[PDB]
Design a protein around this ligand. Structure first.
Ligand code: GTP
Ligand code: MG
Lengths: 75, 8, 418, 180
């Protein structure tokens, strides 16, 4: 969890392989680091508008898995 | 790999 | 459904930790460990264990325990089949579900689990789709990945996922068009002390390897379908045509594939290919006794019986054994009192046997029964049920693929009393 | 010795320049970034997390992080202070109402040791508004000439037209890509 603020910065990376790895990390610790997790929100929001539905779905899933009360309206 | 199989 | 998953080796160690709904404390595994300790064997550990706040559903397989954590009511078989399927998936990607395979491919298996289970609900479940979502760890591919930066994760939902044939991929071609069929039968039998047949039935299953280009429509029919009953069908099969035509029409999935399974009705006497002559003498409180077993052919249908193994679990009075085999190999484990005889195959010129004396515990009384016999064997080129395939036809494609089928019968639950 | 790999990059420009973009809500920060990245105006909603884009200009691979101006995440900017080189502060040229806040937060960042060595470039965005503050007025409201031991400059601009966005980079191409 101490790596959270360092990891989250790569949420916007273009390397899909990394993206998946990042999502895992976020799922594991976002509930605890609720403030830091907020940084990933826009990435998901943009991803949800992408023409690639596989990506949209992935974004949807990950977004929903973030257990932060702040983003309820968003979800 | 084809060896041993009955032609069908 | 599922809150979390722990992979536990029979040693009592935790190797793979997953969480989908929330983080579950590792201390929940103590309830399993307790149960494991109470049980005299890993096979006898209850598959369902209730704890103060969690329900533990688990599967023992290949020295691993798949222990899932569920906090609400979920149909046990739903969970069991699911977890079992996961282990099968690991076998598909890494040859077998083993702790070594897991620790050597942690990231990969971690990723596979994330695709298969979504917040406790089944997501990626069909092999061929999953194979495209995440490429199998081929060393050649990993080289390419280090060279080009290519991913193992795809970026396009496999077309088959949204097709009317979800069990398979689309646009797959082979230059070597072929299809292999494997009819495997198992003999389930209970033989008593006298050598009489107590109970017997035949369990069959037909697997196949499909390397056919495009979307061929296979049609499998039998010469004697009347012998099939209580047949299971993979969903890809057009059941309706099975009923109205008695024909297995379907467009199969790529690669390794199980098609159907069936039972042979008890109305027909199940031929028993092996008979056993036996005698074990236990004098009460004696320092030794006698052991004599002979394995021979019976209803072998003129075929060779091979790959024969005899396993016996001896009573605590047995300390060791003085046996001489006629072939294969005699061994005995004095720690767990297990007698194992590698028989090999039967040649009619002289039937195999294992004979000698038994080293017993002096002062310890003779057992009330002799241990039952667990015997393995295989006969190639033989479907003991007599099941024979009539035709294998293909529609929709133009090539003329290699068509091949095998018939083989192996020991099923074959046990003999004594 | 064999330093070609670096010489190779030098043949086309190895220069990068890590730049953090900060400011308050509705300043036009995102708009700016994407006009520089893409050139076109992309329909959007308020930034909640952060974005990041890389733009090559004058053989410099400028990378900019768009960390939202939302107060709910504002303090998280500290995690982006480490290892930056340039600092973009975007100013809404007619937002007199929150200008004290803008200045204050700017000063808070200016007091940051991780940013101590950073170069400050201020963008007086929305130059095209009829009631926009001019550079002088903005400068005065920010009190930029009171700055000491700090490399700074203000540049007026209009992201809608791209008026001087390149110029901003031009200044940075001499200040971030300075003599060393
Ligand atoms: N009139 C005018 N509007 C502008 C200009 N630049 C940006 N805007 C508008 O200002 C609004 C806010 O722009 P954004 O880029 O979303 O602002 P931001 O700084 O990214 O805001 P946060 O994401 O909350 O940090 C949008 O409606 C833009 O179109 C400009 O130069 N002139
Ligand atoms: Mg923004």
């Amino acid at each position: 969890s101490e790596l959270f603020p360092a990891v989250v910065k790569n949420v916007a990376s273009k390397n899909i392989e990394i993206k998946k790895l990042v999502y895992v990390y976020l799922v594991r610790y976002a509930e605890e680091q609720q403030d830091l997790a907020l940084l990933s929100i826009s990435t998901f929001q943009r991803a949800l508008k992408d023409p690639n539905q596989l990506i949209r779905a992935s974004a949807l899933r990950v977004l929903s898995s973030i257990r932060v009360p702040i983003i309820v309206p968003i979800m | 790999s084809h060896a041993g199989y009955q032609t069908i | 459904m599922i809150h979390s998953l722990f992979l536990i080796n029979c040693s009592g160690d935790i190797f793979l930790e997953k969480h989908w709904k929330s983080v579950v404390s590792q201390s929940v595994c103590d309830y399993f460990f307790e149960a494991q300790e109470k049980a005299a064997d890993v096979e006898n550990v209850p598959p369902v264990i209730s704890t103060p706040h969690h329900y533990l559903i688990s599967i023992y397989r290949d020295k691993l325990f798949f222990v899932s954590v569920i906090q609400t009511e979920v149909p046990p078989l739903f969970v069991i089949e699911f977890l079992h399927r996961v282990a099968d998936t690991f076998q598909d990607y890494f040859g077998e579900c083993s702790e070594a395979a897991i620790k050597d491919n942690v990231v990969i298996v971690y990723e596979l689990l994330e695709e298969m289970l979504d917040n406790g609900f089944p997501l990626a479940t069909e092999s061929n789709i999953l194979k495209e979502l995440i490429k199998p760890p081929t060393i050649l591919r990993s080289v390419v990945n280090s060279i080009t930066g290519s991913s193992n994760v795809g970026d396009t939902l496999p077309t088959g996922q949204l097709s009317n044939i979800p069990w398979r991929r689309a646009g797959v071609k082979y230059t070597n068009n072929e299809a292999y069929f494997d009819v495997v039968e198992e003999i389930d039998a209970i033989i008593d002390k006298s050598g009489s047949t107590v109970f017997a039935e035949i369990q069959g299953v037909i697997d196949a390897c499909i390397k056919l280009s495009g979307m061929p429509d296979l049609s499998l029919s039998f010469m004697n379908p009347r012998l099939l009953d209580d047949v299971s069908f993979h969903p890809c099969i057009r059941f309706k045509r099975w009923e109205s035509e008695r024909v297995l029409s379907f467009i199969p999935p790529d690669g390794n594939f199980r098609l159907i399974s069936y039972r042979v009705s008890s109305q027909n006497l199940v031929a028993i290919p092996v008979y056993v002559k036996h005698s074990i003498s236990f004098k009460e409180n004696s320092s030794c006794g006698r052991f004599d077993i002979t394995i021979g052919p019976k209803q072998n249908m003129g075929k060779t019986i091979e790959g024969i193994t005899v396993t016996v679990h001896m009573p605590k009075v047995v300390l060791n054994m003085n046996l001489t085999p006629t072939q294969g190999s005699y061994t005995f484990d004095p720690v767990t009192k297990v007698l194992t005889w590698d028989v090999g195959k039967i040649t009619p010129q002289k039937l195999p046997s294992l004979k000698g004396l038994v080293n017993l515990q002096s002062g310890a009384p003779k057992p009330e029964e002799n241990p039952s016999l667990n015997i393995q064997f295989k006969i190639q080129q033989l479907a003991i049920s007599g099941l024979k395939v009539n035709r294998l036809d293909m529609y929709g494609e133009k090539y003329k693929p290699f068509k091949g089928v095998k018939y083989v019968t192996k020991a099923g639950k074959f046990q003999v009393r004594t | 010795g064999n330093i070609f790999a670096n010489l190779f990059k030098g043949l086309f420009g190895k220069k990068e320049m890590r730049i953090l973009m900060v400011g308050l809500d509705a300043a036009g920060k995102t708009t700016i970034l994407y006009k520089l990245k893409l050139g076109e105006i992309v329909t959007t909603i308020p930034t909640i997390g952060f974005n990041v884009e890389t733009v090559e200009y004058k053989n410099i691979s400028f990378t900019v992080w768009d960390v939202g101006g939302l107060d709910k995440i504002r303090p998280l900017w500290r995690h982006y202070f480490q290892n930056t080189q340039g600092l973009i502060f975007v100013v809404d040229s007619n937002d007199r109402e929150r200008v004290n806040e803008a200045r204050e937060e700017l000063m808070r960042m200016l007091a940051e040791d991780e940013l101590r060595d950073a170069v400050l470039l201020v963008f007086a965005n929305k130059q095209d508004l009829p009631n926009a503050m001019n550079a002088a007025e903005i400068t005065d409201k920010l009190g930029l000439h009171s700055l000491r031991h700090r490399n700074w400059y203000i540049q007026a601009t209009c992201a809608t037209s791209g008026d001087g966005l390149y110029e901003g980079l031009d200044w940075l191409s001499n200040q971030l890509r300075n003599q060393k």
